[PDB]
JSON list of C-alpha atoms in Angstrom, two decimals:
[
{"chain": "A", "resi": 9, "resn": "UNK", "atom": "CA", "xyz": [9.70, 8.17, 62.70]},
{"chain": "A", "resi": 10, "resn": "UNK", "atom": "CA", "xyz": [11.21, 6.06, 65.26]},
{"chain": "A", "resi": 11, "resn": "UNK", "atom": "CA", "xyz": [11.86, 2.73, 63.67]},
{"chain": "A", "resi": 12, "resn": "UNK", "atom": "CA", "xyz": [13.02, 4.62, 60.66]},
{"chain": "A", "resi": 13, "resn": "UNK", "atom": "CA", "xyz": [15.51, 6.75, 63.18]},
{"chain": "A", "resi": 14, "resn": "UNK", "atom": "CA", "xyz": [16.67, 3.23, 64.61]},
{"chain": "A", "resi": 15, "resn": "UNK", "atom": "CA", "xyz": [17.17, 1.80, 61.11]},
{"chain": "A", "resi": 16, "resn": "UNK", "atom": "CA", "xyz": [19.28, 4.93, 60.23]},
{"chain": "A", "resi": 17, "resn": "UNK", "atom": "CA", "xyz": [21.26, 4.52, 63.66]},
{"chain": "A", "resi": 18, "resn": "UNK", "atom": "CA", "xyz": [22.25, 0.99, 63.01]},
{"chain": "A", "resi": 19, "resn": "UNK", "atom": "CA", "xyz": [23.08, 1.61, 59.29]},
{"chain": "A", "resi": 20, "resn": "UNK", "atom": "CA", "xyz": [25.52, 4.58, 60.97]},
{"chain": "A", "resi": 21, "resn": "UNK", "atom": "CA", "xyz": [27.16, 2.24, 62.86]},
{"chain": "A", "resi": 22, "resn": "UNK", "atom": "CA", "xyz": [27.64, -0.40, 60.46]},
{"chain": "A", "resi": 23, "resn": "UNK", "atom": "CA", "xyz": [28.84, 1.97, 57.76]},
{"chain": "A", "resi": 24, "resn": "UNK", "atom": "CA", "xyz": [31.48, 3.54, 60.27]},
{"chain": "A", "resi": 25, "resn": "UNK", "atom": "CA", "xyz": [32.50, 0.56, 61.87]},
{"chain": "A", "resi": 26, "resn": "UNK", "atom": "CA", "xyz": [33.39, -1.29, 58.57]},
{"chain": "A", "resi": 27, "resn": "UNK", "atom": "CA", "xyz": [35.30, 1.67, 57.62]},
{"chain": "A", "resi": 28, "resn": "UNK", "atom": "CA", "xyz": [37.51, 1.88, 60.93]},
{"chain": "A", "resi": 29, "resn": "UNK", "atom": "CA", "xyz": [37.53, -1.98, 60.92]},
{"chain": "A", "resi": 30, "resn": "UNK", "atom": "CA", "xyz": [39.36, -1.85, 57.62]},
{"chain": "A", "resi": 31, "resn": "UNK", "atom": "CA", "xyz": [42.13, 0.57, 58.53]},
{"chain": "A", "resi": 32, "resn": "UNK", "atom": "CA", "xyz": [42.05, -0.66, 61.98]},
{"chain": "A", "resi": 33, "resn": "UNK", "atom": "CA", "xyz": [41.02, 2.56, 63.72]},
{"chain": "A", "resi": 34, "resn": "UNK", "atom": "CA", "xyz": [40.13, 2.22, 67.55]},
{"chain": "A", "resi": 35, "resn": "UNK", "atom": "CA", "xyz": [36.59, 3.02, 68.11]},
{"chain": "A", "resi": 36, "resn": "UNK", "atom": "CA", "xyz": [34.22, 3.00, 71.39]},
{"chain": "A", "resi": 37, "resn": "UNK", "atom": "CA", "xyz": [30.45, 3.39, 70.41]},
{"chain": "A", "resi": 38, "resn": "UNK", "atom": "CA", "xyz": [27.71, 3.11, 73.35]},
{"chain": "A", "resi": 39, "resn": "UNK", "atom": "CA", "xyz": [24.31, 3.35, 72.70]},
{"chain": "A", "resi": 40, "resn": "UNK", "atom": "CA", "xyz": [21.98, 4.18, 75.55]},
{"chain": "A", "resi": 41, "resn": "UNK", "atom": "CA", "xyz": [18.70, 2.30, 76.19]},
{"chain": "A", "resi": 42, "resn": "UNK", "atom": "CA", "xyz": [16.13, 2.04, 79.23]},
{"chain": "A", "resi": 43, "resn": "UNK", "atom": "CA", "xyz": [19.17, 2.60, 81.70]},
{"chain": "A", "resi": 44, "resn": "UNK", "atom": "CA", "xyz": [20.16, 6.32, 81.65]},
{"chain": "A", "resi": 45, "resn": "UNK", "atom": "CA", "xyz": [23.79, 7.21, 80.83]},
{"chain": "A", "resi": 46, "resn": "UNK", "atom": "CA", "xyz": [23.60, 10.92, 81.69]},
{"chain": "A", "resi": 47, "resn": "UNK", "atom": "CA", "xyz": [26.45, 10.62, 83.99]},
{"chain": "A", "resi": 48, "resn": "UNK", "atom": "CA", "xyz": [28.66, 9.26, 81.53]},
{"chain": "A", "resi": 49, "resn": "UNK", "atom": "CA", "xyz": [27.50, 11.30, 78.77]},
{"chain": "A", "resi": 50, "resn": "UNK", "atom": "CA", "xyz": [28.55, 14.66, 81.12]},
{"chain": "A", "resi": 51, "resn": "UNK", "atom": "CA", "xyz": [32.24, 13.23, 81.25]},
{"chain": "A", "resi": 52, "resn": "UNK", "atom": "CA", "xyz": [32.65, 13.91, 77.53]},
{"chain": "A", "resi": 53, "resn": "UNK", "atom": "CA", "xyz": [32.95, 16.94, 74.98]},
{"chain": "A", "resi": 54, "resn": "UNK", "atom": "CA", "xyz": [29.12, 17.62, 74.17]},
{"chain": "A", "resi": 55, "resn": "UNK", "atom": "CA", "xyz": [27.99, 17.01, 70.69]},
{"chain": "A", "resi": 56, "resn": "UNK", "atom": "CA", "xyz": [24.12, 16.53, 70.42]},
{"chain": "A", "resi": 57, "resn": "UNK", "atom": "CA", "xyz": [24.79, 16.09, 66.80]},
{"chain": "A", "resi": 58, "resn": "UNK", "atom": "CA", "xyz": [22.78, 14.25, 64.18]},
{"chain": "A", "resi": 59, "resn": "UNK", "atom": "CA", "xyz": [23.60, 10.53, 63.92]},
{"chain": "A", "resi": 60, "resn": "UNK", "atom": "CA", "xyz": [25.69, 9.86, 60.55]},
{"chain": "A", "resi": 61, "resn": "UNK", "atom": "CA", "xyz": [28.32, 7.51, 59.43]},
{"chain": "A", "resi": 62, "resn": "UNK", "atom": "CA", "xyz": [30.66, 10.47, 58.44]},
{"chain": "A", "resi": 63, "resn": "UNK", "atom": "CA", "xyz": [30.42, 12.21, 61.57]},
{"chain": "A", "resi": 64, "resn": "UNK", "atom": "CA", "xyz": [31.23, 8.66, 63.70]},
{"chain": "A", "resi": 65, "resn": "UNK", "atom": "CA", "xyz": [33.97, 8.31, 61.33]},
{"chain": "A", "resi": 66, "resn": "UNK", "atom": "CA", "xyz": [35.39, 11.85, 61.83]},
{"chain": "A", "resi": 67, "resn": "UNK", "atom": "CA", "xyz": [35.31, 11.41, 65.41]},
{"chain": "A", "resi": 68, "resn": "UNK", "atom": "CA", "xyz": [37.64, 8.47, 65.79]},
{"chain": "A", "resi": 69, "resn": "UNK", "atom": "CA", "xyz": [40.45, 9.43, 63.51]},
{"chain": "A", "resi": 70, "resn": "UNK", "atom": "CA", "xyz": [43.96, 8.98, 65.08]},
{"chain": "A", "resi": 71, "resn": "UNK", "atom": "CA", "xyz": [45.42, 11.82, 66.84]},
{"chain": "A", "resi": 72, "resn": "UNK", "atom": "CA", "xyz": [42.67, 13.79, 67.16]},
{"chain": "A", "resi": 73, "resn": "UNK", "atom": "CA", "xyz": [40.61, 15.72, 70.28]},
{"chain": "A", "resi": 74, "resn": "UNK", "atom": "CA", "xyz": [37.84, 13.35, 70.41]},
{"chain": "A", "resi": 75, "resn": "UNK", "atom": "CA", "xyz": [39.08, 9.86, 69.00]},
{"chain": "A", "resi": 76, "resn": "UNK", "atom": "CA", "xyz": [40.08, 9.02, 72.64]},
{"chain": "A", "resi": 77, "resn": "UNK", "atom": "CA", "xyz": [37.34, 7.65, 74.77]},
{"chain": "A", "resi": 78, "resn": "UNK", "atom": "CA", "xyz": [33.55, 6.88, 74.18]},
{"chain": "A", "resi": 79, "resn": "UNK", "atom": "CA", "xyz": [30.91, 7.92, 71.73]},
{"chain": "A", "resi": 80, "resn": "UNK", "atom": "CA", "xyz": [27.86, 7.82, 73.34]},
{"chain": "A", "resi": 81, "resn": "UNK", "atom": "CA", "xyz": [24.58, 7.76, 71.28]},
{"chain": "A", "resi": 82, "resn": "UNK", "atom": "CA", "xyz": [21.25, 8.84, 73.41]},
{"chain": "A", "resi": 83, "resn": "UNK", "atom": "CA", "xyz": [17.79, 8.78, 71.53]},
{"chain": "A", "resi": 84, "resn": "UNK", "atom": "CA", "xyz": [18.18, 10.19, 68.16]},
{"chain": "A", "resi": 85, "resn": "UNK", "atom": "CA", "xyz": [21.72, 12.06, 68.68]},
{"chain": "A", "resi": 86, "resn": "UNK", "atom": "CA", "xyz": [25.45, 11.55, 69.26]},
{"chain": "A", "resi": 87, "resn": "UNK", "atom": "CA", "xyz": [25.32, 13.19, 72.78]},
{"chain": "A", "resi": 88, "resn": "UNK", "atom": "CA", "xyz": [28.89, 13.18, 73.48]},
{"chain": "A", "resi": 89, "resn": "UNK", "atom": "CA", "xyz": [32.21, 12.11, 72.46]},
{"chain": "A", "resi": 90, "resn": "UNK", "atom": "CA", "xyz": [35.65, 11.34, 74.29]},
{"chain": "A", "resi": 91, "resn": "UNK", "atom": "CA", "xyz": [33.65, 10.19, 76.95]},
{"chain": "A", "resi": 92, "resn": "UNK", "atom": "CA", "xyz": [34.91, 8.05, 80.09]},
{"chain": "A", "resi": 93, "resn": "UNK", "atom": "CA", "xyz": [33.19, 4.62, 80.63]},
{"chain": "A", "resi": 94, "resn": "UNK", "atom": "CA", "xyz": [34.04, 2.79, 83.50]},
{"chain": "A", "resi": 95, "resn": "UNK", "atom": "CA", "xyz": [36.39, -0.08, 83.44]},
{"chain": "A", "resi": 96, "resn": "UNK", "atom": "CA", "xyz": [35.75, -3.56, 83.71]},
{"chain": "A", "resi": 97, "resn": "UNK", "atom": "CA", "xyz": [38.07, -5.62, 86.61]},
{"chain": "A", "resi": 98, "resn": "UNK", "atom": "CA", "xyz": [36.85, -8.94, 85.24]},
{"chain": "A", "resi": 99, "resn": "UNK", "atom": "CA", "xyz": [39.82, -11.37, 85.28]},
{"chain": "A", "resi": 100, "resn": "UNK", "atom": "CA", "xyz": [38.22, -13.26, 82.45]},
{"chain": "A", "resi": 101, "resn": "UNK", "atom": "CA", "xyz": [38.70, -10.45, 79.88]},
{"chain": "A", "resi": 102, "resn": "UNK", "atom": "CA", "xyz": [41.53, -11.75, 77.67]},
{"chain": "A", "resi": 103, "resn": "UNK", "atom": "CA", "xyz": [45.08, -10.03, 78.21]},
{"chain": "A", "resi": 104, "resn": "UNK", "atom": "CA", "xyz": [45.06, -9.38, 74.63]},
{"chain": "A", "resi": 105, "resn": "UNK", "atom": "CA", "xyz": [42.06, -6.94, 74.67]},
{"chain": "A", "resi": 106, "resn": "UNK", "atom": "CA", "xyz": [42.59, -3.47, 75.21]},
{"chain": "A", "resi": 107, "resn": "UNK", "atom": "CA", "xyz": [41.42, -0.51, 77.05]},
{"chain": "A", "resi": 108, "resn": "UNK", "atom": "CA", "xyz": [38.23, 0.01, 74.99]},
{"chain": "A", "resi": 109, "resn": "UNK", "atom": "CA", "xyz": [37.27, -3.30, 75.40]},
{"chain": "A", "resi": 110, "resn": "UNK", "atom": "CA", "xyz": [37.69, -3.40, 79.09]},
{"chain": "A", "resi": 111, "resn": "UNK", "atom": "CA", "xyz": [35.60, 0.04, 78.90]},
{"chain": "A", "resi": 112, "resn": "UNK", "atom": "CA", "xyz": [32.88, -1.48, 76.83]},
{"chain": "A", "resi": 113, "resn": "UNK", "atom": "CA", "xyz": [32.74, -4.75, 79.17]},
{"chain": "A", "resi": 114, "resn": "UNK", "atom": "CA", "xyz": [32.62, -2.29, 82.15]},
{"chain": "A", "resi": 115, "resn": "UNK", "atom": "CA", "xyz": [29.39, 0.11, 81.07]},
{"chain": "A", "resi": 116, "resn": "UNK", "atom": "CA", "xyz": [27.66, -2.95, 79.93]},
{"chain": "A", "resi": 117, "resn": "UNK", "atom": "CA", "xyz": [27.97, -4.48, 83.70]},
{"chain": "A", "resi": 118, "resn": "UNK", "atom": "CA", "xyz": [26.16, -1.29, 85.15]},
{"chain": "A", "resi": 119, "resn": "UNK", "atom": "CA", "xyz": [24.08, -0.47, 82.41]},
{"chain": "A", "resi": 120, "resn": "UNK", "atom": "CA", "xyz": [21.65, -2.00, 79.82]},
{"chain": "A", "resi": 121, "resn": "UNK", "atom": "CA", "xyz": [23.66, -0.10, 76.74]},
{"chain": "A", "resi": 122, "resn": "UNK", "atom": "CA", "xyz": [24.88, -1.74, 73.64]},
{"chain": "A", "resi": 123, "resn": "UNK", "atom": "CA", "xyz": [28.23, -0.97, 73.04]},
{"chain": "A", "resi": 124, "resn": "UNK", "atom": "CA", "xyz": [30.30, -1.43, 70.03]},
{"chain": "A", "resi": 125, "resn": "UNK", "atom": "CA", "xyz": [34.37, -1.75, 70.01]},
{"chain": "A", "resi": 126, "resn": "UNK", "atom": "CA", "xyz": [36.60, -1.76, 66.91]},
{"chain": "A", "resi": 127, "resn": "UNK", "atom": "CA", "xyz": [40.01, -2.82, 68.00]},
{"chain": "A", "resi": 128, "resn": "UNK", "atom": "CA", "xyz": [43.05, -0.78, 66.96]},
{"chain": "A", "resi": 129, "resn": "UNK", "atom": "CA", "xyz": [45.46, -3.63, 66.89]},
{"chain": "A", "resi": 130, "resn": "UNK", "atom": "CA", "xyz": [43.25, -6.16, 64.88]},
{"chain": "A", "resi": 131, "resn": "UNK", "atom": "CA", "xyz": [40.25, -4.21, 62.86]},
{"chain": "A", "resi": 132, "resn": "UNK", "atom": "CA", "xyz": [37.90, -6.64, 64.82]},
{"chain": "A", "resi": 133, "resn": "UNK", "atom": "CA", "xyz": [34.52, -5.72, 65.61]},
{"chain": "A", "resi": 134, "resn": "UNK", "atom": "CA", "xyz": [33.26, -6.64, 69.11]},
{"chain": "A", "resi": 135, "resn": "UNK", "atom": "CA", "xyz": [29.82, -5.86, 71.36]},
{"chain": "A", "resi": 136, "resn": "UNK", "atom": "CA", "xyz": [29.02, -5.87, 74.79]},
{"chain": "A", "resi": 137, "resn": "UNK", "atom": "CA", "xyz": [25.66, -6.18, 76.68]},
{"chain": "A", "resi": 138, "resn": "UNK", "atom": "CA", "xyz": [24.64, -7.55, 80.11]},
{"chain": "A", "resi": 139, "resn": "UNK", "atom": "CA", "xyz": [28.43, -7.72, 81.00]},
{"chain": "A", "resi": 140, "resn": "UNK", "atom": "CA", "xyz": [29.34, -10.41, 78.34]},
{"chain": "A", "resi": 141, "resn": "UNK", "atom": "CA", "xyz": [31.60, -9.81, 75.55]},
{"chain": "A", "resi": 142, "resn": "UNK", "atom": "CA", "xyz": [30.89, -11.00, 71.96]},
{"chain": "A", "resi": 143, "resn": "UNK", "atom": "CA", "xyz": [34.59, -10.88, 70.16]},
{"chain": "A", "resi": 144, "resn": "UNK", "atom": "CA", "xyz": [35.29, -10.18, 66.49]},
{"chain": "A", "resi": 145, "resn": "UNK", "atom": "CA", "xyz": [31.88, -10.76, 65.16]},
{"chain": "A", "resi": 146, "resn": "UNK", "atom": "CA", "xyz": [30.87, -10.77, 61.50]},
{"chain": "A", "resi": 147, "resn": "UNK", "atom": "CA", "xyz": [29.35, -7.99, 59.25]},
{"chain": "A", "resi": 148, "resn": "UNK", "atom": "CA", "xyz": [26.03, -10.18, 59.16]},
{"chain": "A", "resi": 149, "resn": "UNK", "atom": "CA", "xyz": [26.35, -10.80, 62.93]},
{"chain": "A", "resi": 150, "resn": "UNK", "atom": "CA", "xyz": [26.69, -7.55, 64.10]},
{"chain": "A", "resi": 151, "resn": "UNK", "atom": "CA", "xyz": [23.75, -6.48, 61.77]},
{"chain": "A", "resi": 152, "resn": "UNK", "atom": "CA", "xyz": [21.42, -9.12, 63.40]},
{"chain": "A", "resi": 153, "resn": "UNK", "atom": "CA", "xyz": [22.63, -8.24, 66.92]},
{"chain": "A", "resi": 154, "resn": "UNK", "atom": "CA", "xyz": [21.77, -4.42, 66.39]},
{"chain": "A", "resi": 155, "resn": "UNK", "atom": "CA", "xyz": [18.72, -5.10, 64.51]},
{"chain": "A", "resi": 156, "resn": "UNK", "atom": "CA", "xyz": [17.27, -7.37, 67.63]},
{"chain": "A", "resi": 157, "resn": "UNK", "atom": "CA", "xyz": [18.54, -4.67, 70.29]},
{"chain": "A", "resi": 158, "resn": "UNK", "atom": "CA", "xyz": [18.14, -1.41, 68.76]},
{"chain": "A", "resi": 159, "resn": "UNK", "atom": "CA", "xyz": [14.91, -1.71, 66.94]},
{"chain": "A", "resi": 160, "resn": "UNK", "atom": "CA", "xyz": [11.63, -1.44, 68.85]}
]
């Protein structure tokens, strides 16, 4: 049950971000954990949808209603899309990185959530946790981190 759901969540994130990275589609996916993110869920469009790679991909297609903003995953659902996330004010964040990176950093400073970013400029995948940014991670590295952090 829970472990299978968590592995399916990881697979869904791996497959969708690989798809988007290849096509350089910007994406922002925040996975809630012990810290509650209900307040940011309430800022987006509610989906309460089953997790799948296909739905994640369709959400972030450019020039669509749901593509701007964050997807937030809570429990075993895609809770919301087009959600707002607080932007980090850190001066350490590279000027090369965009708004999605700053939003992922900002939510990671005030929650224990794991947030994944796909850069629309480079296709690189980045991850934020606990106020730190892990830039342009490999597929294997993404896999290891998600296995460690999302499987309990």
